[PDB]
Amino acid sequence: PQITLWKRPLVTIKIGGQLKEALLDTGADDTVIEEMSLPGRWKPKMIGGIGGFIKVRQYDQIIIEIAGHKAIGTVLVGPTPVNIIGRNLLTQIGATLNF
């Protein structure tokens, strides 16, 4: 699909058995989701944005379905105000910016 940017590019994701709304965010290196449980090992990480840093849990090799396209990669979990799909998973679904 082609998504225009008049409005926030929100899509439905499926992660950890749950449906969530998330923002397709080319300015995010990493995918960051609101607090939830995920299986397997994790390690702590700090990630910074506008406003400073938050502490997150880093889970590797997590499968997500993004607008119907499956991808696997690292997912950061913590107190983000918005669920964000970052470049680490946008590449896997073949997303590009075009102008």
Ligand X SMILES: CN[C@H]1CO[C@@H]2OC[C@H](OC(=O)N[C@@H](Cc3ccccc3)[C@H](O)CN(CC(C)C)S(=O)(=O)c3ccc(N)cc3)[C@@H]21
Report how far residue 40's alpha carbon sits from residue 50's, in angstroms, rounded to the nearest whole number: 30
Q: Among Na ion, ligand X, its own copies, none, what binds residue 95 when CB lies within 5 to 8 Å by partner kind?
A: its own copies
Segment 31 to 50, residues that bind ligand X, using CB under 6 A = 32, 47-50
| Site stretch for ligand X (CB under 6 A), options 13-21, 25-33, 65-73, 91-99 | 25-33
* Residue 29 is a binding residue for ligand X (CB under 6 A): yes
- Considering only CA atoms, which of 67, 97, 87 is closest in space to residue 76? 87
Find the distance separating the first CA and the last CA of the chain, reported in whole Å.
Answer: 15
Q: For residue 25, indicate whether it is catalytic.
A: yes
